[PDB]
Each structure stands twice: as C-alpha cells, then as structure tokens.
C-alpha cells in the first residue's frame, strides 16, 4: 500500500534512541554475556554482588511495564548466583518466562553456552 | 585478495556470542539508555543505588582489560548520580575517555538527550 510497520524498511538511521524492542535485545545480550563469563566458583561476595546487580537492574530498567514484570518475577524466583552453570540457566529460564508472556517460543537452555560464549559446535560463528 | 577482516563481509550468522566490540556497543546502549530515563530529582536511595549499579557493572564486565580500565576510571572520577542531567553528562564524558583511549573521536555531549532519548531534532528518527 505504501508506509510500513516493518521498521527495517522505514527508519534507516542507526544512531537513534533504542525503542522497547531494541533496548530489550541489547539488555538480554548484556545480561547473558555477563552470566556466560561469571565464575564457576564465585566467592560469597561475588554471589551477593551479582544478585544485587540483577536487583538494581530491575529498579532502573526504563520500560516501566517491563521493569514491573521483572520485579515481580525476581520476588517469586530469586536469582541463583551460586555458580556459572546455575546462573546462566536461571537467567535462560527467566528470559523464557518473558518469551512465553510475549508469544515467543522457548529458547533451548541447553544451547546457552554455545549461544553466548562458545559459539555453535558446527563452527557457524567462525 | 580473498578472506577479509571486515566482519560484516565474513560472518553472517547473527545469533552468535558478542565479541569485545559488539558487547561494547550493547553495553553503552544499555548504560546511556538507563541514564537517559533516570529521574531529574532522584531520591537519595536512587542516587546510592545507581552508583552501586555502575560499581557492580565494573566488577562483572567480562572483557578483563575493559573492566580494569573502567575500575580505574571510577576510582578517579566517581559517578555523579545526583540528577539525570548530571549523570547523563558524567556518563558521556566517561564514554569519551574510552573513545580517546581507543583513537575514536569525542562525541558531542550536547547531543546526549537527542541520541539516547528524544531523537534528533530534525526528525530523522521518525
Ligand atoms: C529484563 C527484561 C524484561 C522485559 N520485559 C518486557 C515486557 O514485560 N514486555 C515487553 O513487551 N517486552 C519486555 N522486554 C523486551 C523483550 O523481552 C524482548 O527483548 C523484545 O521484545 C525483543 O525481542 P526479540 O524477539 O528480538 O528477542 P529477545 O527476547 O530480545 O532475545 C534476544 C536474543 O536472545 C536469545 N534468547 C532468546 N531467549 C533466550 C533465553 N531464554 N536464554 C538465552 N538466550 C535467549 C535469542 O538469540 C534472541 O534472538 C524485556 C526485556 C528485558 C531485558
Ligand atoms: C564500560 C566500557 C569499557 C570499555 N573499555 C574498553 C577497553 O578498555 N578497551 C577496548 O578495546 N574496548 C573497550 N570497550 C569497548 C569500546 O568502548 C567500544 O564499545 C567498542 O570498541 C565498539 O566501538 P564503536 O565504534 O562501535 O562505538 P561505541 O564506543 O561502542 O559507541 C556506541 C555508540 O554510542 C554513541 N556514543 C559514542 N560516544 C558516546 C558518548 N561519549 N556519549 C554518548 N554516546 C556516545 C555513538 O552513537 C556510538 O556509535 C569498553 C566498553 C564499555 C561499555
């Protein structure tokens, strides 16, 4: 017909303020990448710090409906920051809660180390 | 000649682990966007929380040379979290320190509200 609601076909300037979706994509990348490299045997101070980091992220996330949704989840399901394995998985399952809320499919949590740190075992990241 | 070191011409799969540069781009977007919507008159608890959030981000940032560089800066130049105006500018000038370290030009701090929240006044984000 003429205009389109597919943003990629419309708004071409990259250096603009992130919208709700684009901030989401950046933020999941930041959180999953921070978790991917977290210690396998973190100190007690690290475990405390990472839980506080996720709590503070929930206080300041600037999409208010998204931040409320996050604060509700963290109240029902505190972050497991005991180890890399536990925290990476914990964060995957949380991300999946949001995906299911929004009508998106589940990400296979078995893929989190490939996806965010190591690259796919088939070599498609090289 | 044949291979290229311009990543865009080589590695086409998007769902791969962020490298140092790509994590940087995501992270500056997250930090500048969080600052852009921070209160103009934050409570004392908010001011304390935002400073602690930036400190914790420096503890967990997974590029070790980058995290060390950040920890050094925050020791010399604590975040000003007193107001949106102060914190957005504080974070711009910090980002500029990193840009100059890496041979990149200064971003004009007068542009931070346009860039990260409001869109350019000429309408090029619409
Ligand atoms: C904490 C948080 C709360 C949010 N709350 C809301 C909200 O309440 N309402 C709303 O409209 N939007 C919310 N958003 C934005 C939303 O989650 C999506 O980021 C946005 O809709 C863009 O979706 P996307 O399809 O690009 O993929 P995203 O969900 O942004 O995912 C980005 C990439 O991460 C990978 N991935 C997907 N799922 C997982 C997983 N479970 N584990 C590991 N990797 C995964 C995939 O490679 C994917 O392409 C929130 C985002 C954040 C960060
Ligand atoms: C906290 C932190 C520390 C880092 N330390 C290092 C390091 O020690 N060594 C290293 O090699 N890399 C480091 N990086 C990565 C580096 O800063 C860049 O992110 C990366 O090199 C990609 O650069 P870029 O050209 O894509 O633009 P980036 O610097 O990633 O900037 C992204 C976008 O932000 C906007 N912008 C640029 N400057 C400002 C500013 N001053 N204020 C507001 N908006 C701005 C521009 O629109 C720009 O395109 C760090 C990143 C972070 C987040």
Q: Which domains does chain A have, with CATH numbers?
A: 17-117 (1.20.120.310)
Answer for the pair B28, B98: CB distance below 8 angstroms, yes or no: no
Distances (CA, A) of A125 to A13, A47, B22: 27, 31, 14
Q: Give A82 to chain B, closest Cα distance, Å.
A: 15
Residues A9, A97, B56: CA angle, nearest 5 degrees: 90
Can you tell me the distance from the alpha carbon of A117 to that of A99, in angstroms, rounded to the nearest whole number?
21
Distance CA A37, CA A113 (A): 10
Q: How far apart are CA A64 and CA A25, in angstroms?
A: 16
Q: Helix or strand or coil: residue A41?
A: coil
Cα torsion A65, A66, A69, A74: sign: negative
- Tell me whether residue A113 is exposed, middle or buried, using C-beta atoms within 10 angstroms of its C-beta: 0 to 12, 13 to 18, 19 or more: middle
The Cα diameter of chain B in Å comes to 59
Angle at B42 between CA B70 and CA B26, to 5 degrees: 40
Please check whether residue A31 is in contact with residue A91, taking contact to mean a CB–CB distance below 8 angstroms: yes
Which H or E run includes B55?
A: helix B44-60
List, as one string, the DSSP characters of B92-103.
Answer: HHHHHHHHHHTT
Rounded-to-integer distance, Cα B111 and Cα A102, Å = 34
Q: Report the residue count for chain B.
A: 126
Q: What is the Cα–Cα distance from A79 to B103, expressed in whole angstroms?
A: 39
User: Is ligand 1 within 6 A of the CB of residue A96?
Assistant: yes
Nearest-CA distance from A74 to chain B in Å? 17
Which runs of consecutive H residues, i.e. helices, occur in A1-126? 20-36, 44-60, 64-76, 84-101, 112-113
Starting from the CA of residue B28, give the closest ligand: 2
Contact B34 A125 (CB under 8 A): no
Q: Are A84 and A17 in contact (CB under 8 A)?
A: no
Does residue B29 contact residue B91 with C-beta atoms inside 8 Å?
Answer: no
Method: X-ray
A49/B60 touch (CB, cutoff 8 Å), yes or no: yes
Rounded Cα distance, A52 and A68, in Å: 17
Contacting residues for A124 by C-beta, under 8 A, at least 6 apart: B13, B16
A82-110 burial code (b ≥16 CB/10 A, e <16): eebebbbbbbbebbbeeeeeeeeeebebe
Resolution in A: 1.5
Tell me how many degrees the CA angle B113-B73-B96 measures, rounded to the nearest 5: 35
CB-facing half-sphere around the CA of B21: CA atoms within 13 A: 5
């Amino acid at each position: 017909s003429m205009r389109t609601q597919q943003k990629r076909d419309t708004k071409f300037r990259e250096d603009x303020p992130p919208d709700r979706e684009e901030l989401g994509r950046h933020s999941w990348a930041v959180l999953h990448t921070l978790a991917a490299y977290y210690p396998d045997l973190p100190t007690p101070e690290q475990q405390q710090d990472m839980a506080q980091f996720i709590h503070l992220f929930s206080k300041f996330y600037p999409x208010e409906e998204x931040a409320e949704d996050l604060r509700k989840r963290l109240a029902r399901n505190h972050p497991d920051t005991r180890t890399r394995a536990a925290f990476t998985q914990w964060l995957x399952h949380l991300h999946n809660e949001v995906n299911r809320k929004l009508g998106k499919p589940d990400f296979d949590x078995s893929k989190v180390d490939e996806r965010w740190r190591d690259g796919w075992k088939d070599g498609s990241x090289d």
